């Protein structure tokens, strides 16, 4: 997260300023939002379009052999 | 075959077979610097279409060349062995090459004439000295803050890894 | 079937931080990379440390 | 800045740039040339001399002549508006529908998408060609490399598929005529127009054309592939798209590489080879993919140099394949168009897995039977099968029948074939073999199985015969 | 800094003729301004020929080449297990970093005679054929030789998966840390592969060293050596590792190229000569140590893909000359379906027995022999069609045995089971039945034994051998199973 | 003199020797070496630069690095102390049993002893291995090539020969496991220890082990051959002994040479082999001898590259050989062990006098029949295999018996086989075949003959088989 103090002081300082804001963590930026929504689609494909907030359920059966 | 003065590096090939020749020749009797300048002079005395006329066409026959680059280099007086070696490189084709040959010998931002180390900036030490890590401290007093886009800009440079830590 | 949507939400927020990280970074760095340069004295620190090499290496 | 022609030996233009000396791959535009005479830097030879490769042709270039580095790789117009359009290598429409109003440019180096980024779940791209699906099943996103002899309907096939497939498709397609017969491109043009898939009131055809035909000068041909990759990545990644990418012919890429190799002062590997065939390949190949972000379903024409596969080039290639299409001249000699040999033409994605075992097994019996048969023909070559077991005779004939049954008319090349195209959905495919395999059929003529559509058609034909 | 920095004398081809760096350590891995690493192969009098690990569109001349001052080591640990790494030991699995923060020199040469103890352990794959007929031990080296995606890889995989049960053992006699070198193998393939292991999650005890297709040539080159160091690590920690070199073939190619780029001459088969040394030295590092070194092992499964079965393919010839046998895969059987597709008449483990369990030895000796005739009886008094019962039996039996060894794509197994089923045929018990039912049977038989004769299985496994009693247990069991198969 | 590494181009170390040079072939020691880096001088490239050959790995080396010439070529430990010792090239106790308290050093360039020194007569060395003696009667002191390509128990056989022979004589040994798998040398190691023929309690054996495995600088590996030679010559004459010299594998030597040849600037001629191929061998083989003051009965394992002997190298090799064992991989594929090629496995020195005519003839007849049999093969593959004409059958079978009888159990690969190895001294053998030749056992059938030592055992085996 942190190394070279001579740059680092300013650089890290600007990063925290981000966190210290709630119009986004200082801003967000369209570009990210566009990709987010895309990437969000894809991984739903990755593991099917059910919603794993709920779990599966099954049904039951039998037949006579002879 | 003779063991020779081969003050190292010294680029042994490369127009420096000759340089290394004179790194034993010149140094024998150490007529080095004197001759260094012979060479310098010559440098443009040649390289004009005038001495280097035979450069212009070597069709002119090498004999002619050793009789026009001078009867030696003969017209002048750059000749200790200078002329004989001229009259050799000529024939030996190393004439069009000569600046570099001269360089190789000479020129010594570092080579028995000076020094050059760097991590940051032109840090052309220049000095035949035994040390320089002071003679840099020195230099850092012609300045010590100034610009430093007069060579190293350590600004991007070191500013390189960090961009890596993030990724 | 449960797990993957939970892990998706986390994984997206993770992916969504890194991108914000590079883009955040890029603005912060592409702004302040410029300003620094006024410090002559990092070249102050170059020489200083450079003496603690030039002297202090050998 | 500017450079000097210091040496021109062919399209290896030795440029001394001093003034700058950008990295390698910086595109230079020659001053004193009306042409956008690109040389793309190849080596920094030193002496601030670079070896560049003119992509382009040369001539009329007085040495020393000034070259101004354009300072970057080929940046080429991008955007969906490339569909329809035939652009040359340098991305200018050679469809000449005026220019293109790009959106952006791209350096035609595009890289390897990430290992971590891939989605990689091969699913059959069906084709409706019995022979294909069954034997050389294709996967959606798959890279199929079409080994095939010259003119063997190799091209035909690919096209034929394109019709069959690219139509059905929802993603786009790219046709890269790399080193292709311009003529064939002309032809191609006209079908595409005709077909209206290239609908020309549509730069929103389902297909973008990039052509860097046979005629180009080497560099152009060499690099055009990279370009094509770059485009498709645009459509995939950027436009989502499952691209079907027609390359005719990657061989010419290869060719081009090797051709230059010499001039690239190399030690050029065997046969003169570019040893950087390998690197080239990797570097290309990895650009080739089917990301998480979609597919480049990659239809790679591979001329089989001297039809030698053994030939390192293809040999390497195989590694990158996923579906291999070997059109087999022997078979071709057997007249067959289809001319494939699937003991050769194999698909990694041909698996009991990916495409069912039925396929596999029905095939394994076939592959087997054929494999055995293949063993037999030679003994038979002497002996005939005459004093050699009848079951074998049967089976052989069956194998062959199956062979014949694989012969399948071309709808496109009805002109060529006479025969009228056939396309057979899977089931009837299965069925077919299963039946023939059942020997059920076998009381029948071999040639009945020839150039059929579904088995019925063989049946139909049987009647028509006998 | 100075001196042991260089200005790129010339660059092209990721071959940096480097001005300066002169007092350099031979084969020092150097460091680029780009941060790419390179290796100082040729110290020429007036340049340093440096192979650039990366690529040179990314660089240009006069550039500072700085020594790293290090001759290559690679991170080593064992936190490579569960990891797919590149040669430099860096995630490419992209799973954050690796836990292998030790580094260990690749160029470390092979030990002596004395730090070894030869084999006497078996090494098992679950592949009946393998384990039987070219029975392998651990610390060994054996060629997987074959053509393309025959499940080309599969062979390794299933084996590895098979080791899972052993890794589910708590041994270190069978608990086998698996090392997969991917040379030249496009990421996609690799991905699948990784995935396969993942799915199998045998990956947990596994390094996958992956130099896919991509990689600048040295990278693929290096990888094995890397893997090698990494494997020596286990070996010296008594640990038994298996490294699969798949394949040097691609490597060699690259290497030649590398040489050529080094402006060194194309040697035999246009391949330079000490590519032999290359691999030879590489491969000498695979071993079974003696006990002082924890007895550990690095079992080597190099893979070479022949091109057209060409083994006189120089490098194959070489490798063969190295190999302690080779596992020859043939197409035909494959096309026939038959996987095994092997020609065991061309596959060898010269070793044979050190590499075995008595259990296996008990059926296999005989079987091998039997197959030998069986195969043979395809050639004398047959090139393809003829009859007589005595021998017909042998054929029948043989055919059966074929099935019995016929082990389709994907099949990790445990040896006693294998023996179990094998025993049935060997001891002539199903000869009757058709091949088609064998498999089915085999399966069936398996749940049966698995369940029931789990007892028995316990034993056989235990005895490492089948006792006569256990045999008897089989005899009725099998007969009965068969009977059950009816009855 | 002192040298500087001026170029390290791979392990080709070009040294510019500064204070002059040392002569050719001088072993040079690099100053700054934790494991002295013997350099073998190869060319005086001139400029007091030599091209030298690294005989170690070149890692870590500073360019320029200082070399001090050992003032000689490679000089190596020599003395009786080598018996039961594993020496490397540089003699080093790679037995790892501490330094060899050798009492002599020698430059490993041993050369060709003179024409006059050569014992013009040798006596057939009988191996008691039927086939061996029979077709290639070996002579004590002989140069035996064991051609054989890879893996076929080749090494096993060889070892076994060692068992059979080296034990059996006051003949000493040198075993040079050159280029061999360190592993196999290990394995091998254990066998001697085990055998007690490496008996270490008295360090002595009678045996020098010289190893130069396939992980060593080729030149070095190349040179380990010379090393052994140099030593053995010492034992040969000086110790007076018939040393048995096992070289595994002289092909690899040649090879080692070839790999470097390029680098040596020699254009390594056809098939890649060094253009100096001839000299390399010539000098080597000519260095080898059985003189009058001793014998180096030289057993050279010869890998047959690709079983191609027409491979120039083996082709050359052949010249030097005077007894050739060409093991036939096909025969090996025919499963045998005796896997040999028999109708190629010769000694030009088979004689109706010297092996007596009986032997000689028997062999010749036999060789003939096999050759004939071979002719018959031509019918049979496609035209019948318990089927055609019958007199020929008679021979076929006879040949076949002969084959089987030619097969003899392996005597340590009993571990594998369970067949106890066998051996048959010459007469019973000759006779043996004569009986078969006499067509005696015709009532008797084939498989009884397989893998036996003397014929009785076959007779016995028949009986077992009649059940």
Per DSSP, F107 falls in state E
Burial of B57 (0-12, 13-18, 19+ CB in 10 A): exposed
Q: Where is D30: in which H helix or E strand?
A: strand D27-30
Question: From the candidates C22, C39, C50, C57, which should be mutated to test the interface with B, based on the most B CB atoms within 10 A?
Answer: C50
Give me the residues of D, 385-424, that contact E with CB < 8 A: 388-389, 392
Q: Do E394 and E374 form a contact (C-beta atoms < 8 A)?
A: yes
Residues of A in contact with C31 (CB under 8 A): 14
Pairing outcome for strands D66-72 and E28-32: unpaired
Q: Specify whether the backbone of E59 is left (phi greater than 0), alpha (psi in -120 to 50) or beta.
A: beta
Which of the residues F67, F92, F148, F181 would you substitute to probe the E interface, choosing the one with the greatest number of E C-beta atoms within 10 Å? F181
Strand order in the sheet with D295-303: D86-87, D207-212, D173-178, D242-248, D295-303, D143-148, D323-326
Contacts of E220 (CB under 8 A, 6+ apart): E183, E184, E211, E250, E251, E254
Closest CA to E90 of E177, E210, E179, E186: E210
Instruction: Note whether E10 and F45 are within 8 A (CB).
Output: no
CB contact under 8 A, B159 and A11: no
Inspect the interface and report whether the beta carbons of A3 and B159 lie closer than 8 Å: no
**In units of Å, what resolution does this entry have?**
7.4
Token pair of E198 as six digits: 């993942």
Query: Where would I find the H helices in D203-322?
Result: 218-233, 250-261, 277-285, 312-317
Of E2, E22, E45, the CB nearest to B117: E2
DSSP state of A27: -
CA F46 to chain centre: 38
Contact flag B11-E35 (C-beta cutoff 8 Å): no
C37 SS3 class: helix
CA distance E19 to E49: 9
- Domains, chain A, ranges and CATH? 1-48 (6.10.280.200)
Contacts of B13 in chain E (CB under 8 A): 45-46
Q: Give the closest of C18, C41, C46 to B154, CB-based.
A: C46
Nearest-neighbour CA in chain D from E219: distance (Å): 12
Judged by 3 or more CB pairs under 8 A, whether C touches B is: yes
With H, G, I as helix, E, B as strand and everything else as coil, classify residue F90: coil
Ramachandran angles phi, psi of F18, nearest 5°: -110, -45
Q: Which long-range contacts does E96-99 make (Cβ < 8 Å, 24+ apart)?
A: none
Burial of F455 by CB count in 10 Å (0-12 exposed, 13-18 middle, 19+ buried)?
buried
Asked if D292 is an interface residue toward chain A (Cβ–Cβ < 8 A), one would say: yes
What does the radius of gyration of chain C's CA atoms come to, in whole angstroms? 22
F261-273 core/surface letters (b: 16 or more CB in 10 A; e: else) = bbbbebebeebbb
Closest-CA distance, E251 to chain D, in angstroms, reads 10
Distance CA D108, CA E442 (A): 56
- Using CA atoms of F197, F198, F202, F206 in order, give the dihedral in degrees to the nearest 10: 70
Domain CATH for B65: 1.10.520.20
Is the separation of the CB atoms in D118 and E94 below 8 Å?
no
Tokens 């030490």, located at residue: B125
| Partner-chain contact D293 A42, CB within 8 Å | yes
What is the SS3 assignment for E143?
strand
Do D106 and D230 contact (CB within 8 A), yes or no? Answer: yes
| CATH class of this structure's domain E1-70 | mainly beta
Q: Binding site residues of D for Mg(2+), as ranges?
A: 155, 180
Q: Which member of C25, C46, C55 has the closest CB to residue B120?
A: C46
User: What contacts C11, CB < 8 A, 6 or more positions away?
Assistant: A43
**Interface check E390 vs B, CB under 8 A:** no
Other beta carbons less than 10 A from residue F456's beta carbon: 11
Contact E135, E324 (CB under 8 A): no
Q: E140: left (phi > 0), else alpha (psi -120 to 50), else beta?
A: beta
Q: Is F96 left (phi over 0), alpha (psi -120 to 50) or beta?
A: left
Q: Tell which of E53, E93, E151, E188 to mutate to test the D interface (max D CBs under 10 Å).
A: E188
| Paired residues of F145 in beta bridges | F300, F324
| Burial per residue of D256-284, b for 16 or more beta-carbon CB atoms within 10 angstroms, e otherwise | bbbbbbebbebbbbeeebbbbbbbbbbbb
Edge to edge, the sheet with strand E325-328 lists: E90-91, E83-86, E206-211, E176-183, E240-246, E297-305, E143-146, E325-328, E348-349
Core vs surface per residue E245-256: b (16+ CB within 10 A) or e: bbbbbbbbbbbb
Residues in binding site of E for Mg(2+): 153, 246
Tokens of F90: 């540089």
What is the widest separation between alpha-carbon atoms in chain E? 88
Spatial contact of E27 and E71, defined as CB atoms under 8 Å apart: yes
What is the distance in angstroms between the Cα of A14 and the nearest Cα belonging to chain D? Answer: 31
Could you count the other beta carbons within 10 Å of the beta carbon of residue C13? Answer: 10
Separation between Cα atoms, residue D168 and residue D434, nearest integer Å: 28
Domain range E71-356, CATH architecture: 3-Layer(aba) Sandwich (3.40)
Tell me which DSSP letter residue E310 carries: B
Q: What is the 3-state secondary structure (H, E, C) of chain B?
A: CCCCCCCCCCCCCCCCCCHHHHHHHCCCCCCHHHHHHHHHHHHHHHHCCCCCHHHHCHHHCHHHHCCCCCCCCCCCCCCCCHHHHHHHHCCCCHHHHHHHHHHHHCCCCCCCCCCCCCCCCCCCCCCCCCCCCCCCCCHHHCCCCCCCCCCCCCCCCCCCCHHHHHC
Touching D (3+ Cβ pairs <8 A), the chains are A, E
Superfamily of E357-487 according to CATH: ATP synthase alpha/beta chain, C-terminal domain (1.20.150.20)
Q: Which strand (E) or helix (H) includes residue F55?
A: none
* Preceding amide of F459 cis, omega within 30: no
Q: Token pair for residue D5?
A: 């022609």
Q: How far is A61 from chain D (nearest CA, A)?
A: 28
Contact in structure between A42 and D293 (CB atoms under 8 Å): yes
Q: How far apart are the first and last CA of chain D?
A: 80
Residues of B in contact with F20 (CB under 8 A): 3
Quick one: closest CA in A to D121, which residue? A46
In chain E, residues under CATH classification 2.40.30.20 are: 1-70
Residue intervals in chain E for CATH 1.20.150.20: 357-487
Residue of C29, C43, C57 with shortest CB distance to B144: C43
DSSP code for E116: B
Pairing of strands E206-211, E176-183: parallel
Domains and CATH numbers, chain F: 1-73 (2.40.10.170), 74-349 (3.40.50.300), 350-467 (1.10.1140.10)
Residues in chain F: 467
The SS3 call for residue E172 is coil
Q: For residue E323, what is the DSSP state?
A: -
Catalytic residues of D: 154, 180-181
Residues 6+ apart with CB under 8 A from F460: none
Give the chain B residue nearest A6 (alpha carbons): B159
């Amino acid at each position: 997260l942190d190394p070279v103090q001579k740059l680092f002081v300013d650089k890290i300082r600007e990063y925290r300023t981000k966190r210290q804001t709630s119009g986004g963590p200082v801003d967000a930026g369209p570009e990210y939002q566009q990709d987010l929504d895309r990437e969000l689609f894809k991984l739903k494909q990755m593991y099917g379009k059910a919603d794993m907030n709920t779990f599966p359920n099954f049904t039951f059966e039998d037949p006579k052999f002879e | 075959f003779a063991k020779l003065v081969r003050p190292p590096v010294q680029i042994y090939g490369i127009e420096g077979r000759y340089a290394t020749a004179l790194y034993s020749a010149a140094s024998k009797q150490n007529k080095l610097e004197q001759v260094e300048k012979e060479l310098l002079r010559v440098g443009q005395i040649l390289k004009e279409p005038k001495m280097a006329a035979s450069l212009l066409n070597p069709y002119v026959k090498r004999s002619v060349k050793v009789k026009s680059l001078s009867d030696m280099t003969a017209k002048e007086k750059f000749s200790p062995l200078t002329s004989n070696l001229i009259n050799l490189l000529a024939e030996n084709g190393r004439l069009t090459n000569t600046p570099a040959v001269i360089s190789a010998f000479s020129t010594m931002m570092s080579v028995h004439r000076g020094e050059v180390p760097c991590t940051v900036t032109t840090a052309s030490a220049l000095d035949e000295t035994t040390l320089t890590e002071l003679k840099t401290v020195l230099k850092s007093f012609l300045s010590k803050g100034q610009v430093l886009k007069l060579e190293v800009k350590i600004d991007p440079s070191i500013m390189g890894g960090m961009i890596v830590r993030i990724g | 079937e449960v797990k993957n949507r939970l892990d998706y939400h986390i994984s997206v927020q993770n992916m969504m931080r890194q991108k914000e990280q590079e883009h955040m970074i890029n603005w912060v760095e592409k702004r302040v990379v410029q300003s620094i340069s006024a410090q002559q004295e990092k070249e102050t620190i170059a020489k200083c440390i450079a003496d603690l090499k030039l002297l202090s290496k050998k | 800045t500017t450079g000097r022609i210091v040496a021109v030996i062919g399209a290896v233009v030795d440029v001394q740039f001093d003034e700058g000396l950008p990295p390698i791959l910086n595109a230079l535009e020659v001053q004193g040339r009306e042409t956008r005479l690109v040389l793309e830097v190849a080596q920094h030879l030193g002496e601030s001399t670079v070896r560049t490769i003119a992509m382009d042709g040369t001539e009329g270039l007085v040495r020393g002549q000034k070259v101004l580095d354009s300072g970057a790789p080929i940046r080429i117009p991008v955007g969906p508006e490339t569909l329809g359009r035939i652009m040359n290598v340098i991305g200018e429409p050679i469809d000449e529908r005026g220019p293109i109003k790009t959106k952006q440019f791209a350096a035609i180096h595009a890289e390897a998408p990430e290992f971590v980024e891939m989605s990689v779940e091969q699913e059959i791209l069906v084709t409706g060609i019995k022979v294909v699906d069954l034997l050389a099943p294709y996967a959606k996103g798959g890279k199929i490399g079409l080994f095939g002899g010259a003119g063997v309907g190799k091209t035909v096939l690919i096209m034929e598929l394109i019709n069959n497939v690219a139509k059905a498709h929802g993603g786009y397609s790219v046709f890269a005529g790399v080193g292709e017969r311009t003529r064939e491109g002309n032809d191609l043009y006209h079908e595409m127009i005709e077909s209206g898939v290239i609908n020309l009131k549509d730069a929103t055809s389902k297909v973008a054309l990039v052509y860097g035909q046979m005629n180009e000068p080497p560099g152009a041909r060499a690099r055009v592939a990279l370009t094509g990759l770059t485009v498709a990545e645009y459509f995939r990644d950027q436009e989502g798209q499952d691209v079907l990418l027609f390359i005719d012919n990657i061989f010419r890429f290869t060719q081009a590489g090797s051709e230059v190799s010499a001039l690239l002062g190399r030690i050029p590997s065997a046969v003169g080879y570019q040893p950087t065939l390998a690197t080239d390949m990797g570097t290309m190949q990895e650009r080739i993919t089917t990301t998480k972000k979609g597919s480049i379903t990659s239809v790679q024409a591979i001329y089989v140099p001297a039809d030698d596969l053994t030939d390192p080039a293809p040999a390497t290639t195989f590694a990158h394949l996923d579906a291999t299409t070997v059109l087999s001249r022997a078979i071709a000699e057997l007249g067959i168009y289809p001319a494939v040999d699937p003991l050769d033409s194999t698909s990694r994605i041909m698996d009991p897995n990916i495409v069912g075992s039925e396929h596999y097994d029905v095939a394994r019996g076939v592959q087997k039977i054929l494999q055995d048969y293949k063993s037999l023909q030679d003994i038979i070559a002497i002996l005939g099968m005459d004093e050699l077991s009848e079951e074998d005779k049967l089976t052989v004939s069956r194998a062959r029948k199956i062979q014949r049954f694989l012969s399948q008319p071309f709808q496109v090349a009805e002109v060529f074939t006479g025969h009228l195209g056939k396309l057979v959905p899977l089931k009837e495919t299965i069925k077919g073999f299963q039946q023939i395999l059942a020997g059920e059929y076998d009381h029948l003529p071999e040639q009945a199985f020839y150039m059929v559509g579904p088995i019925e058609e063989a049946v139909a034909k049987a009647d028509k015969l006998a | 800094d100075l001196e042991e920095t260089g200005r790129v004398l010339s660059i092209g081809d990721g071959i940096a003729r480097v001005h300066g760096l002169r007092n350099v350590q031979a084969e020092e891995m150097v460091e680029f301004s780009s941060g790419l690493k390179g290796m100082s192969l040729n110290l020429e009098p007036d340049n340093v020929g440096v192979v650039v690990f990366g690529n040179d569109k990314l660089i240009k001349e006069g550039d500072i080449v700085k020594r790293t001052g290090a001759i290559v080591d690679v991170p080593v640990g064992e936190e490579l297990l569960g990891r797919v790494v590149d040669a430099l030991g860096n995630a490419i699995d992209g799973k954050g970093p690796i836990g292998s923060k030790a580094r260990r020199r690749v160029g470390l040469k092979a030990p002596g005679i004395i730090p070894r103890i030869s084999v006497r352990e078996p090494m098992q794959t679950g592949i009946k054929a393998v384990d039987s007929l070219v029975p392998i031990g651990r610390g060994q080296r054996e060629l997987i030789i074959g053509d393309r995606q025959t499940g080309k890889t599969s062979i390794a995989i299933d084996t590895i998966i098979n080791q899972k049960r052993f890794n589910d053992g708590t041994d270190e006699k069978k608990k086998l840390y698996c090392i997969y070198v991917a040379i030249g193998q496009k990421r996609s393939t690799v991905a699948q592969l990784v995935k396969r292991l993942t799915d199998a999650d045998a990956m947990k005890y596994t390094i996958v060293v992956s130099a896919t297709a991509s990689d600048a040539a040295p990278l693929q080159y290096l990888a094995p050596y890397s893997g090698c160091s990494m494997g020596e690590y286990f070996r010296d920690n008594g640990k038994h590792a298996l490294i699969i070199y798949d394949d040097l073939s691609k490597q060699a190619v690259a290497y030649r190229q590398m040489s050529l780029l080094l402006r060194r001459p194309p040697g035999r088969e246009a391949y330079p000569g000490d590519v032999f040394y290359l691999h030879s030295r590489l491969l000498e590092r695979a071993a079974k140590m003696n006990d002082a070194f924890g007895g550990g092992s690095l079992t080597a499964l190099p893979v070479i893909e022949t091109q057209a079965g060409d083994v006189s393919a120089y490098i194959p010839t070489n490798v063969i000359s190295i190999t302690d046998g080779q596992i020859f895969l043939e197409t035909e059987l494959f096309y026939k379906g038959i996987r095994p597709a092997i020609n065991v008449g061309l596959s060898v483990s010269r070793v044979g027995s050190a590499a075995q369990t008595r259990a296996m030895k008990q059926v296999a000796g005989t079987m091998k022999l039997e197959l030998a005739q069986y195969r043979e009886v395809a050639a004398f008094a047959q090139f393809g069609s003829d009859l007589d019962a005595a021998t017909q039996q042998l054929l029948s039996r043989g055919v059966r045995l074929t099935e019995l060894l016929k082990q389709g794509q994907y099949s990790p197994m445990a040896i006693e089971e294998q023996v179990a089923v094998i025993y049935a045929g060997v001891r002539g018990y199903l000869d009757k039945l058709e091949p088609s039912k064998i498999t089915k049977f085999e399966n069936a038989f398996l749940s049966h034994v698995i369940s029931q004769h789990q007892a028995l299985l316990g034993k056989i496994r235990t005895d490492g051998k089948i006792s006569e009693e256990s045999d008897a247990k089989l005899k009725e069991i099998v007969t009965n199973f068969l009977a059950g198969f009816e009855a």
